[PDB]
């Protein structure tokens, strides 16, 4: 399950870090569902692609080490 | 849907390979693909010679390439104006230095792989599908063979129901290992679809 970094995506932090020099966005869309949710970069509601669309996932502290797609489920009535 | 390939079956006695070159577990893949694109260009751009075997040898950057025909000169020119073009084409893709023999079969109606092509040719020139078989067998049986047999698959005469004409003579002991039976397979790209032609010539023994 890894232990040398958290294999989280370049294009995502670039956008998170440089969003947090004063930034409060929900319109933030992404296809990088395999990137680990990073220590406390919370607040911002990410929009995750499940294969069909982007899901409004508002993020909290207690859901950190989890990868992004655990919240954007990929199939229906399960 | 039974019956082995009769060369495959006999690569023990009674028949040797179209490639007598040794090697090992990282060259073979490539010493092969080459081996093939060689015959790739040869079989396409030398059809008229009428090339039966295309035997090949190797020993690091040399290659024997003994091309068998019975129209041997149609490969050459009238002195060497083509056979020079070819040792040129070969070594252009084969970044190596290519030998290039040429050969004559003293009797081409014993060359199954020709007998096939001949009959195949005829079929495209809307010929007599059944007397072709009748003739070709008699040709091969004429050149002192011990046994002959020819097969066409189907759409015989453009027919909508695919059929199968066959004809034979003398022995063709397809179950004997010491048989020495040449096997020729030819295509036939007619307007209405592809026929397929097989040729079998018996000779051998002890």
């Amino acid at each position: 399950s890894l232990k040398k970094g958290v294999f989280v995506d370049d294009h995502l932090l670039e956008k998170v870090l440089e969003l947090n020099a004063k930034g409060e966005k929900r319109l933030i869309k992404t296809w990088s569902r395999r990137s680990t949710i990073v220590p406390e970069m919370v607040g911002h509601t990410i929009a995750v692609y499940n294969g069909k669309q982007h899901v409004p996932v508002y993020i909290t502290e207690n859901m950190v080490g989890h990868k992004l797609g655990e919240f954007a489920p990929t199939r229906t009535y399960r | 849907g039974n019956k082995i390939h009769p060369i495959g079956f006999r690569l023990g006695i009674t028949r040797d390979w179209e490639s007598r070159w040794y090697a090992g577990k990282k060259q073979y893949r490539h010493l092969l693909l080459e081996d093939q694109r060689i015959r790739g260009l040869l079989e396409k751009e030398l059809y008229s010679a009428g090339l039966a075997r295309v035997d090949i040898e190797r020993a690091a950057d040399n290659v024997a390439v003994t091309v068998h025909v019975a129209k041997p000169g149609v490969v050459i020119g009238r002195g060497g104006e083509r056979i020079r073009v070819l040792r040129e084409e070969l070594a252009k893709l084969t970044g190596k230095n290519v030998a290039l023999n040429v050969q004559e079969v003293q009797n081409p109606n014993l060359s199954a792989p020709l007998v096939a092509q001949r009959v195949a040719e005829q079929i495209e020139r809307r010929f007599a599908v059944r007397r072709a078989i009748k003739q070709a067998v008699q040709r091969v049986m004429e050149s002192g063979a011990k046994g002959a047999k020819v097969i066409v698959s189907g759409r015989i005469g453009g027919a909508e129901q695919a059929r199968t004409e066959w004809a034979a003579q003398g022995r063709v002991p397809l179950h004997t290992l010491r048989a020495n039976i040449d096997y020729g397979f030819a295509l036939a790209r007619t307007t209405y679809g592809v026929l397929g032609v097989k040729a079998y010539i018996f000779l051998g023994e002890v």
Binding site: - | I7, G8, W17, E18, S19, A23, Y28, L32, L33, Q36
Partner: protein
């Protein structure tokens, strides 16, 4: 898609994981032996001709 595919399998790719074998003859994704680049089909074929050196029918 078998054409745009046979080609793309010759390329070098973003990340080497996306590589793979492919019957160089019969352009084929599955059952391609490493010591040949050859689909079990386009293979049983050559083998029978003798175009494959030293390869015999096994029997015991």
């Amino acid at each position: 898609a078998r054409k745009a595919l046979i080609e793309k399998a010759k390329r070098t790719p973003k990340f080497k994981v996306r590589a793979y074998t492919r019957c160089v003859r019969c352009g084929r994704a599955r059952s391609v032996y490493r010591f040949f680049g050859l689909c079990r089909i386009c293979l049983r074929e050559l083998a029978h001709k003798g175009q494959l050196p030293g390869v015999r029918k096994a029997s015991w």
